[PDB]
Amino acid sequence: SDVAIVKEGWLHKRGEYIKTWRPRYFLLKNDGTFIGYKERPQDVEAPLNNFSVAQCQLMKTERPRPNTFIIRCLQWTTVIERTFTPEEREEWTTAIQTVADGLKKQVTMNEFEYLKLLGKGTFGKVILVKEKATGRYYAMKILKKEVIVANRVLQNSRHPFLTALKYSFQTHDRLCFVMEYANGGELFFHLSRERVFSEDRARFYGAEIVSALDYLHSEKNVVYRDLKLENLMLDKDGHIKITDFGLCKEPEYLAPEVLEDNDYGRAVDWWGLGVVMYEMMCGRLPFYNQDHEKLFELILMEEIRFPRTLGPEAKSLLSGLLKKDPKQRLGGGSEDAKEIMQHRFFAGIVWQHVYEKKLSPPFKPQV
Ligand SMILES: O=c1[nH]c2ccccc2n1C1CCN(Cc2ccc(-c3nc4cc5[nH]cnc5cc4nc3-c3ccccc3)cc2)CC1
């Protein structure tokens, strides 16, 4: 199957973490691809599902400026949205919706029992529910369907280190997603009590993250982009479970190309591997400051310092993961997760073993 450009041109994309207005050249193809570039590209390669406008609908508004439209897609279980003379704004938003709809062409609210509120966001709330039929618990992501809409594909998407989506059902006004719940708390906790983690213990959590990210990259062709210490829970045995609770805005964990609103890919995930792993092995964020203009400046501009404790392999790995330039960042190459798996700091490891959970958990949750 081949595809052509439905429409293209310059667009003003609005920064999410730096809310300047930015010029980007976009092109929509009839695979669903909607991608913006730093400048008018040449050959015009398998893009990520992130840049696909499937299951979307648009919008128009004159704030902060008069010519503006908005897209809101339901990616997996999350709702994402992006903010971009007035005549075009009714042809662009014509084509995008066309392809979106063209691309679309191809358990009830209570077996569950409310337990507590896990969190709330612009687009909804996350709930703990006991299954009244089973007893074992779940998290339930409840999105308001009128922000967007105003398949058991979820058995393929099983990975030992990702929280599983077990049920998704709709009702009168809400979109519900029932994902599994890990018992053993999240790292942010256990790292506070421990202050820092050995390289061995950091190699355990990093390895399981890499397995999960490899899986999302190769199999699902999506970047996760939200890798942060607080998004890592443990199951009852102490193994990783990466959470999926995005309700709107989740910065210290985002890569330069993301805060700048440039082209990004699988590399933003490895950057975050860098930050999460640096944070484990050092006790501190690599880039922090109470002031946000300083925070962004550190991440984009400044070098990273290593405590003297750190072995040569551990810092070769962190330096590479935390390169500012994506095409130079360890993992940003064509082989992706493999060049991480093959770095010397992970020497000896056979990765089918990590998948199978043959690795010894440094920390057993009391559950
Ligand atoms: O980019 C953005 N612009 C935004 C603008 C506003 C708000 C939020 C935005 N975001 C986020 C959107 C969500 N971003 C996190 C995430 C990534 C992948 C899966 C994800 N996608 C899948 C697809 C599949 N298609 C077929 N099978 C699939 C399985 C998937 N499994 C899993 C997943 C599940 C559990 C843990 C981790 C990933 C989930 C969450 C973080 C950024």
Numbering used by the authors: 2 to 45, 49 to 88, 92 to 113, 145 to 188, 199 to 298, 313 to 429
Could you share sentences copied from the article?
Aberrant regulation of the PI3K/AKT pathway is implicated in the pathogenesis of several human cancers and inhibitors for multiple targets in this pathway are in clinical trials for the treatment of cancer. The PH domain directs AKT translocation from the cytosol to the plasma membrane by binding to the membrane lipids phosphatidylinositide (PtdIns)(3,4)P2 and PtdIns(3,4,5)P3, which are products of phosphatidylinositide-3-kinase (PI3K). AKT is subsequently phosphorylated resulting in kinase activation. Comprehensive and elegant experimentation revealed substantial differences in the relative positions of the PH and kinase domains of inactive and membrane-associated AKT, resulting in the inactive form being termed the closed or ‘PH-in’ conformation; whereas the membrane-associated form is referred to as the open or ‘PH-out’ conformation.
We were able to co-crystallize ΔHM-AKT1(1–443) with Inhibitor VIII and to solve its structure to 2.7 Å resolution. The PH domain nestles between the N- and C-lobes of the kinase domain with Inhibitor VIII binding to all three regions. The superimposed structures show the PH domain fills part of the space occupied by the αC-helix and phosphorylated activation loop in the activated AKT kinase domain structures; thereby sterically preventing the kinase domain from attaining an active conformation. Inhibitor VIII binds to AKT1 in an allosteric binding site formed at the combined interface of the PH domain and the N- and C- lobes of the kinase domain. We were pleased to observe a ring-stacking interaction between Inhibitor VIII and Trp 80 as an alanine mutation of this residue in AKT1 has been shown to render Inhibitor VIII inactive. Ser 205 has the only direct hydrogen bond to Inhibitor VIII. We did not observe Glu 17 binding to the inhibitor in the co-crystal structure, however Glu 17 forms a salt bridge with the positively charged kinase residue Arg 273 almost certainly providing additional stabilization to the closed ‘PH-in’ conformation. The conformation of the ATP binding site in the AKT1:Inhibitor VIII crystal structure clearly shows that the PH-in conformer is unable to bind ATP or ATP-competitive inhibitors. In contrast, the AKT1:Inhibitor VIII co-crystal structure reveals the allosteric inhibitor locking AKT into a closed conformation with its phospholipid binding site blocked by the kinase domain.
